[PDB]
């Protein structure tokens, strides 16, 4: 999940952008 | 660009800032 | 007055602004 | 739900006000 | 110091302010 | 839960601080 990618690992802007409306 | 883990509220702050006026959905 | 769909974080922003110092509950 | 009224449809201020404390 | 009940979004605002740059987890 | 302590009762700063990262 996004929680996993970004808290356990380091995520990129693009990975965050996938959650924008 | 991202050099930090984004845990708890930090991930929500990041999405708020990244997504701008588009808004976002979280955590799903 | 409202002329937009309020999806994801946008609904939370709307409630934050509408409810002011009262605060709000969401999504229930 | 409020998500439904306001994302699927257009909701009014009064509908939002029902969720204020 | 706290003299109010912190219900709904008010608790999240409190945690945001108290925790500062640390961030927080909620409601768990 | 923290919701309980702080909405039903009055909680202290320290109680809130336990939820900071
Ligand atoms: C699970 O659902 C099963 O999966 C199949 C069915 O569900 C599919 C997804 N769920 C849906 O409901 C349908 O979604 C379809 C896609 O819709 C578009 C995206 N939206 C959502 O997914 C809605 C999900 C919804 N909510 C969220 O995700 C959003 C929650 C965000 C909360 C955090 C936002 C904080 C905003 C902060 C603003 C404060 C302003 C402060 C200003 C002060 C400034 C100053 O004073 O200077 C959900 O309920 O899950
Ligand atoms: C399900 O629960 C079954 O139904 C029967 C039992 O439950 C009944 C309802 N649930 C309850 O827990 C009891 O509620 C009773 C009524 O209480 C009053 C209303 N409160 C709630 O319902 C509490 C529910 C709670 N939380 C929420 O709903 C609130 C969540 C809001 C999150 C979003 C808020 C974002 C705030 C943003 C602030 C950021 C500030 C940024 C400032 C920067 C400014 C600058 O720098 O300039 C729950 O856990 O569900
Ligand atoms: C249940 O999970 C079963 O228990 C066992 C397993 O789970 C254990 C806990 N859950 C985990 O996922 C693991 O957690 C381990 C500990 O990690 C560190 C803490 N983080 C979490 O717990 C993550 C949980 C996560 N999310 C949250 O708790 C955070 C949700 C916060 C939402 C509210 C934040 C609002 C921020 C507002 C910012 C808006 C900015 C506005 C600026 C405008 C300013 C201006 O214009 O001037 C979860 O998914 O639960």
Author numbering:
A (entry chain A), D (entry chain A), F (entry chain A): 1 to 21
B (entry chain B), C (entry chain B), E (entry chain B): 1 to 28
Q: What wording appears in the published article?
A:
Two amino acid substitutions (A14 Tyr→Glu and B25 Phe→His, named OI106) were sufficient to stabilize the insulin molecule, with an optional additional deletion of B27Thr (named OI189) conferring further stability. Deletion of B27 Thr (OI189) leads to additional 3–5-fold improvement. The reduced insulin receptor affinity increases the intravenous (IV) half-life in dogs from 25 min (human insulin), to 24 h (OI338) and 17 h (OI320), respectively. Characterization of pharmacokinetic profiles (after oral dosing in GIPET®I) shows an absolute bioavailability (F) of 3.0% for OI338 (CV 100%, single dose, n = 40) and 3.9% (CV 78%, single dose, n = 63) for OI320, calculated relative to IV dosing. To test the accuracy of the simulations regarding the distribution of OI338 and OI320, the link between dynamic changes in the pharmacokinetic profile and the pharmacodynamic response were studied in healthy and conscious dogs during euglycemic clamp settings after a single oral administration of OI320. OI320 showes a prolonged lag time of 6–8 h between the plasma Cmax and maximal pharmacodynamic effect as quantified by the GIR required to maintain euglycemia. The lag time between Cmax and maximal GIR may be attributed to the delayed appearance of OI320 in the peripheral compartment where muscle and fat tissue are responsible for insulin-stimulated glucose uptake. Healthy and conscious mongrel dogs were pre-treated once daily with OI320 for three days to reach steady state and on the fourth day, OI320 was administered via the portal vein by a 40 min square wave infusion to mimic an oral absorption with up to three times the daily maintenance dose to study the hypoglycaemic response and dynamics of glucose turnover.
Elimination plasma half-life of ~20 h in dogs and ~70 h in man is achieved by a strong albumin binding, and by lowering the insulin receptor affinity 500-fold to slow down receptor mediated clearance. The crystal structures of these low-affinity insulin analogues were determined to assess the effect of the substitutions and addition of albumin binders. The crystal structures of OI338 and OI320 shows a conserved insulin structure with small differences compared to the human insulin backbone, with root mean square deviations of 0.37 Å (OI338, 44C(alpha), Cα atoms) and 0.56 Å (OI320, 41 Cα atoms).
